[PDB]
């Protein structure tokens, strides 16, 4: 059945970004997906998105800009300590110049640079470049 | 052979045979 809806959302937006489309419909909508899309938007990788509100689990329509090469999710959500984050960003990111391991800490869902800044460790969610 | 005590017993028997042969040769 359907598990880990963030994987479905990232796979859908990656498939549509590879196809050259301008908008993606992803369903269902959860709060972690919204935070991931917000993190990508603050770095200017996707753009504006709308949360279509059903009384069920909602839907999202995101707008695409061709700035995204690969958006990916890491399953299972491994425990990333702060000392071990360098190995993770050596494995997943394509270069030291760009790319983002999204990870959730008790301070919120953020990037690896913000996790370095705030001295907190968390669980890994994704990467995008 | 298995059964560690039996393997060590085999080794002890071979030891005793070689020791008997050597001691018989050195008495001459």
């Amino acid at each position: 059945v359907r598990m880990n809806v963030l994987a479905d959302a990232l796979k859908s937006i990656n498939n549509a970004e590879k196809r050259g489309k301008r908008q993606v419909l992803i369903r269902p909508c959860s709060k972690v997906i919204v935070r991931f899309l917000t993190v990508m938007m603050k770095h200017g990788y996707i753009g504006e998105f709308e949360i279509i509100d059903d009384h069920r689990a909602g839907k999202i329509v995101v707008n695409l800009t061709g700035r995204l090469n690969k958006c990916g999710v890491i399953s299972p959500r491994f425990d990333v300590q702060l000392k071990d984050l360098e190995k993770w960003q050596n494995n997943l990111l394509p270069s030291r110049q760009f790319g983002f391991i999204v990870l959730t800490t008790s301070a919120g869902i953020m990037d690896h640079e913000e996790a370095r800044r705030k001295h907190t460790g968390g669980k890994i969610l994704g990467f995008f470049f | 052979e298995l059964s560690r005590v039996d393997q060590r017993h085999r080794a002890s028997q071979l030891r005793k045979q070689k020791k008997e042969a050597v001691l018989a040769e050195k008495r001459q």
Binding site: S75, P76, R77, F78 | -
Partner: protein, 141 residues
């Protein structure tokens, strides 16, 4: 597909060791049967007493006769065949001579033109075959 949960560690390690048993190198190293069937018993060199000289026919596409020596090892009593390497070195080996024997290099596999021989003669009567071949030492008897 692989199980990629968080609590699936024992499944992964059990599967890895069970499929580790399906390797050839791992099974030859760890089963303890090829170690007991090895005449040397996991040793670099062995020392034996010469029983006979054998002319082993070469494998078909090369037509020659290899001068090997059938010896009986001291420490376990096994009969093995060792190839005497160079030309004229067979005349240094005599029957009922003490020989130091090592393998060829393929770790239990028959090497090259000689069928069924894993070993080669290194020393004859406590002097090497190379020193006798080069005329550097004399052998006692």
């Amino acid at each position: 597909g692989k199980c990629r949960g968080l609590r699936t560690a024992r499944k992964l390690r059990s599967h890895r060791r069970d499929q580790k048993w399906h390797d050839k190198q791992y099974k030859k190293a760890h089963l303890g049967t090829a170690l007991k069937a090895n005449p040397f018993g996991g040793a670099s060199h062995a020392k034996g007493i010469v029983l006979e000289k054998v002319g082993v026919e070469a494998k078909q596409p090369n037509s020659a006769i290899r001068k090997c020596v059938r010896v009986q090892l001291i420490k376990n009593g096994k009969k093995i065949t060792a190839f005497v390497p160079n030309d004229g070195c067979l005349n240094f080996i005599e029957e009922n001579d003490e020989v130091l024997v090592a393998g060829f290099g393929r770790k239990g596999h028959a090497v090259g033109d000689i069928p069924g021989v894993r070993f080669k003669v290194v020393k004859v009567a406590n002097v090497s075959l190379l020193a006798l071949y080069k005329g550097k030492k004399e052998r006692p008897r």
